[PDB]
């Protein structure tokens, strides 16, 4: 079986099986899944790896069609904590892809420019997982001509160990940088988060950073997102910076989301193929623990259980602008610095496109993520 004939046949199987899933024919879906199992492979080429995670996702969805069987398969629920591995895979994403470095650079510039002249700055991090985002902003605040303001950072995360490492690293750097700095952790999932927990004081300039968190609220195009954006609006932030996936993965039907997500993750899996060896354990961890989980959630989950409801930038702009925010175009030279970052080792093939004052991070011609800055209107 030719490798190129193997790849295209895998695509047909995915669409065919998905139709059998929608039709509900378990016999016809099982036969399609049997074929996928022998051809797909997490160690194979790009299409074999892509097929492996979409195949597992599709099989998980039809497993949910029998709730008794699905639950019984987890009756001995393996309640567990895998924090160290999850920190490790996030570090790999930060280092093997330029997405977060570009996002951090652009959002830190937008915050610094919003905090010109402010002596009291409070930054709210809705996903405080990587301390590299604020370590750079600490040095930049210290280097700014007017000297550093009093900096306060509120970190929100659902795991204490993640907040302990960030707090330790940020206090250690701020103590070296001689910056008056305060970090208060907030242990909470984002849905149960209340404004009162953020403990914002009066008279301090505020900035909100939402890295890949806004689409979470679209789960059961949403009313939960409106309430959260309005809650953020009431806090009167001087700037809100939003980093989101730039793909329509929130389509109504299974076939809709399968078609688009196949194109998006084919691009993401393509970067690793052109850069990292097939035998790399780092590559497999990222492909499984990150993209595989997102693919599985997009394909096999519904209702509130489907949190990876990615939408394009144009939808987010309307949604955020209707919530009372005005767009703050990213700095031309911040965009130039982000492009120079892409000239780094192993970042060729990426491109940054400007779209209505916002940045779109692309692989080849395929959009992947967007970065946008917003201020309160009225």
């Amino acid at each position: 079986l030719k490798p190129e004939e193997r790849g295209l046949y895998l695509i047909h199987l995915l669409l065919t099986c998905a139709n059998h899933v929608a039709s509900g024919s378990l016999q016809n879906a099982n036969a399609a899944l049997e074929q996928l199992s022998h051809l797909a492979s997490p160690d194979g080429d790009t299409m074999q790896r892509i097929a492996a995670y979409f195949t597992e996702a599709l099989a998980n969805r039809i497993l949910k069609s029998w709730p008794g069987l699905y639950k019984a398969l987890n009756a001995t629920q393996t309640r567990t904590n895998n924090v160290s591995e999850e920190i490790h895979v996030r570090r790999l994403f930060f280092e093997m892809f330029p997405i977060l470095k570009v996002s951090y650079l652009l959002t830190n510039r937008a915050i610094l420019e919003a905090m010109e002249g402010e002596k009291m700055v409070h930054v709210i991090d809705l996903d405080a997982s990587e301390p590299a985002q604020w370590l750079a902003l600490l040095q930049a605040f210290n280097s700014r001509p007017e000297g550093p303001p009093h900096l306060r950072i509120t970190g929100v995360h659902h795991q204490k160990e993640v907040l302990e490492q960030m707090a330790h690293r940020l206090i250690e750097e701020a103590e070296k940088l001689d910056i008056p700095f305060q970090f208060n952790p907030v242990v909470s999932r984002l849905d149960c988060l209340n404004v009162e927990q953020l403990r914002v004081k009066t008279g301090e300039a505020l900035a909100v950073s939402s890295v890949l968190q806004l689409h979470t609220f679209l789960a059961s195009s949403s009313g939960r997102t409106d309430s959260f954006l309005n809650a953020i609006w009431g806090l009167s932030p001087k700037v809100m910076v939003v980093t989101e996936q730039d793909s329509d993965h929130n389509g109504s039907t299974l076939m809709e989301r399968l078609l688009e997500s196949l194109y998006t993750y084919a691009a993401l899996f393509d970067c690793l193929e052109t850069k990292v060896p097939r035998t790399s354990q780092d590559r497999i961890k990222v492909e499984k623990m990150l993209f595989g989980e997102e693919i599985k959630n997009i394909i096999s989950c519904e209702g509130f259980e489907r949190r990876e409801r990615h939408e394009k930038l144009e939808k987010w702009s309307q949604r955020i602008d209707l919530a009372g925010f005005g767009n703050v175009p990213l700095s031309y030279y911040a965009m130039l610095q982000a492009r120079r970052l892409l000239q780094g080792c192993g970042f060729d093939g990426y491109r940054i496109k400007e779209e209505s004052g916002c940045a779109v991070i692309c692989w080849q011609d395929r959009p992947l993520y967007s970065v946008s800055a917003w201020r309160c209107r009225k």
């Binding site: 295209l8 695509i11 080429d45 393509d270």
Partner: peptide, 14 residues
Amino acid sequence: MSATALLQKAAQMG
């Protein structure tokens, strides 16, 4: 034989 091009080749004939 990129995967992003395989999807393009299959979608045309399908």
